[PDB]
């Protein structure tokens, strides 16, 4: 149930009804491919083997508005931390020996980590059985080999053009089969296992493959998978657009814009705020975000939608004198900031222009509306089903005296502006 | 005929002679691949069929300075709007039944859209004819199948690692043949058809492939192609760089920079302004932009190049006290902002340093010049043929008193600065 | 020997011990593939030849905080400059005729350039010998052809989906073999040759492939490779985070942040400063940067780490009143800016929370620490071995009176703030 409210007084809109899936952590696992140390259908194998030899060579060669408020993480530090351990002597042999008679196992490593290790491809035992004695005979060994070899080559290609770190994680790095099994064996809730299983492509996109080592006939890379420690909490998206006075004299106008646009998700008694809404992806009513790109705010930040002048949170805005027209396409409609001589319209498919916007900040829902045009820019609106509510209010920019209005404030708020205006009235 | 003028008084340059190709809209079409529901050269087919089976599985699994002034669109809303319709019951059967005896057809869909539908691959009729009865015989059916199957796999790979939305649109999604035919059948001018046909790679880059549905032996994805509703209008690129006073005392200097740099194209009586010049691509003298990343301004914005103090448009600038050196490589030359103790030079290939810049903002054309060096940074200049004109003028930063100069203004203009300076002179 | 110092007085840290590898220039070379003009195992060749024909068709069709202070280069201007020369009549024939009996040669071109030219694939002599007379016989010609043809197709695919410019440079554009030979024949020091040879993937990432021409049975593209004119100079990374007062009253607090974060490398008597630390890549203790994304500063910029109030350089800061919590993961630890009611902790793997941060800016090294948590955000810390030093000092934000503190300054410095504060004290 996606709904939306437009706030006329502050030229912003809030889309709600979303459920969260936030990456809160990482799950690291070691993926191994055992390699072989070597020297008509045979000539096919000859070629297939030469390519094997230089893929191995390649792998060996491989190892010789409010965004500015965010902190800075190190995205593959967990995975790299695991990799640095595989570089201890005999450490890959602990993995090697544990995966002797089994393809997947939980190996207790040295530094005090217990990682699910997984041998996805046993080229070693292939070459050292159905290859070594040669003897043409059957074509089925030729194609089974080309198949296993191809995975190797695709892994090698990805690592080389990406300097050993890839994202999203391909099906060559980790098949649907293996990923599903990995998902099934993680120390997580069932609600989490099913979430991941029904969204593997989103999972792959939030994952890393990290080339670790190729030592003692063994290729090891670490796959770093998202932990969704916050699921099914309410999320909402806040859209904002410039609110300006609409005097006919050019340059006599003042504007303010709510700078706190982005994604918001309830999270452990606070709210996770994602200023760069590209760090989140929406699947139906589920929104996948990453906590690394967020701020943790008091829940009172939401009072800025209902009352931007509330005493519990100092709502954030920027100020300018630059009244350009534009539109923001929301979840269930469109905000239009229309100023000057700009032609601003909304249209239906078969009927054309159905609404002409006058100067100021207005809004239209997506019911019956397919496109929106501001100046020379045509925006298609999203055709998501959901109810829209227009909340009438006096545009707050009307409450300010342009003679003492502080323009060109960026990292500002309702209070900071009040203090300045008052500071300006002190000069009398 | 590419020309260029440098304005000494404002440390900016304008490259003109370009012709426009602006994406103003979208053309949506439905691409279908009919699928089959199933169970030495045959063993080849066996493998080729197993890969078919899990590609289908993968697809099913798949479905379970002035940039801050821009508005915010929803780039694939038109395509997704078409997709939501294919999810109506029997709606893909309207497409299916219409493409019974033909590969391309204009199917009138339910929601009041008429989309060109296109069956690019008929795997269904391949498996259910030259495959089902099996019977080795000829190798030509093996390779014709691997070929058709490969397209499927490549489409599947792109959709999975991109969560069902790809751009640019590959030749696997849509061949040169099919694209050309699609281009040929669109309700557009010939000037537009030829523009697209002579720039398919640019077209592909401005296009989207959107995975829609895999229902009733049919795979459907929507290809979203650019409409160039503005062609062959004059475009010009504005380059800007910091203009500072050059006093020898550190920290006693003031700077201003024109913030209105970017691409400009004449468009329907106004001017389309593209602040993020990476949203535009130049092919020879043709410049491909996207109106979604633009502002619509009065044509008077161009008066800022000839006269930044003009009364018809309030030209935009920022102010600082930070006189670092740098260079901007233009279309036909280079702007050099040289301050402090920085070594700034221009050079020819075989002759080395030919010009040493003194402190301030200067310019050199690309005739005889191959490189430009500011400090430890070497820039190669573009070697495009075209005439360059140096327009002499007193640097306007000399007209300002540093004692009342407002520095650290970002979203500013000539007037805003005047009002502030005057506001500062009021304290006397 | 990577070390790190945290400065408590300014909430910043400096990681040192790094060695430089800066791209200072470009090395351009011409890569050619000679093409053929044409018309069971033969049917294999038939298919392989049809794909050849349309790859050629595709290629022919193909040719018809302080970042805002950076200048603007033109990244492939050197390579494109070389390309414009190959478009002179008979100019590719100079290359063609010179590569008659040899695969690599230094061809003196017209415009006064001498470029190493390299024929990596001779399809012409393949088709016009082991193909033309046909005659099935041996399978080894089939697979040797598919192999050579495949490279062609992969090159063609990359150029088409990238509009003729690719980066990083694939092994299909240029094999490890060819790249190593190219590296070996460049007019560079041995220290440089070995640097490149031990980091080909980094090299490929800093390279461009530029499709030039397909004329007279010859395909030519220009490969643009990095020149590392600065090697083995000391580099250091500066991390910064917001420093705020910690009064319990909301909105009564003031903050400052050092804006000069990024990479620093000693370079020719000055310092190269890279504000966008993503323009640099770290391999062990080697850091690869690009001078195009840098400023050239006096070496005195480093005094801001030991003494931000020094008289030799005006250290840069921004100011605000926005005391949000966050963390910056450094090379050997973590900076924590903890304000308001935010829960801030550091943890060990097997032991959990080991340190709770109080309000203000603090730091913890990576020894014994694996994760850091600020609010709802968990950051893994880097597990690099190296010594960390905590430098105690009074947080400088305590030296300022909030009543005359200038907040919302972005492009500011210690002096600019002093002048403003003093300017504010003038109103008495
Ligand atoms: C990603 S980021 O760059 O860190 C955001 C910075 C945005 N920002 C601005 C507005 N502003 C820019 O956006 N840029 C950068 C650009 F030019 F790219 F827009 C500025 C260059 C100088 N002065 C003000 C600039 C004023 C301001 C004031 C405070 Cl206290 C904090 C942040 C602020
Ligand atoms: C602003 O006005 C309020 C009146 O409500 C007053 O209390 C305050 O002192 C004034 N000045 C500032 C800087 O807030
Ligand atoms: C600035 O100077 C002009 C004089 O041309 C005057 O008209 C104006 O009132 C002054 N002040 C402002 C804020 O523009
Ligand atoms: C600031 O204070 C210093 C005192 O050290 C004084 O010299 C200076 O004139 C004052 N004002 C400015 C704008 O620097």
Author numbering:
A (entry chain F), B (entry chain F), C (entry chain F): 27 to 65, 74 to 98, 137 to 206, 213 to 506
Paper lines:
JNJ-53718678 is a recently discovered small-molecule RSV fusion inhibitor currently under clinical evaluation in infants hospitalized for RSV infection. To further characterize the exact binding mode of JNJ-53718678, the X-ray crystal structure of the inhibitor bound to prefusion RSV F was determined at 2.5 Å resolution. Electron density for JNJ-53718678 was observed in the central cavity along the threefold trimeric axis. JNJ-53718678 asymmetrically occupies two of the three identical lobes of the binding pocket and forms aromatic-stacking interactions with RSV F residues Phe488 and Phe140. In lobe 1, between RSV F protomers A and B (FA and FB, respectively), the chloro-indole moiety is involved in π–π stacking interactions with Phe488A, Phe488B, and Phe140B, and in a weak C-H/π interaction with Phe140B. Similarly, in lobe 2, between RSV F protomers A and C (FA and FC, respectively), the imidazo-pyridinone scaffold forms π–π stacking with Phe488A and Phe488C, and a weak C-H/π interaction with Phe140A. Once JNJ-53718678 is bound, the chlorine atom points into a sub-pocket of lobe 1 formed by Asp486, Asp489, Thr397, and Ser398, and is involved in a halogen bond with the backbone carbonyl oxygen of Thr397. Rearrangement of the side chains of Phe140, Phe488, and Phe137 also results in the formation of a hydrophobic clamp that traps the trifluoro group of the inhibitor in the more solvent-exposed, membrane-distal region of the binding site. Finally, a sulfone oxygen, positioned at the more solvent-exposed, membrane-distal part of the binding site, is involved in a water-mediated hydrogen bond with the side chain of Arg339 through two structured water molecules. Similar to other RSV fusion inhibitors, the binding of JNJ-53718678 to residues in the fusion peptide (Phe140) and heptad repeat B (HRB; via Phe488) suggests that the inhibitor may stabilize the prefusion conformation of RSV F and prevent triggering to the post-fusion state.
Respiratory syncytial virus (RSV) is an important respiratory pathogen that causes substantial morbidity and mortality in patients of different age groups. In order to initiate its replication cycle, the envelope of RSV must fuse with a host-cell membrane. This process is driven by the RSV F protein, which assembles during biosynthesis into a metastable prefusion conformation. After a triggering event, prefusion F protein undergoes a profound conformational change that facilitates fusion of the viral and cellular membranes and results in an extremely stable post-fusion F protein conformation.
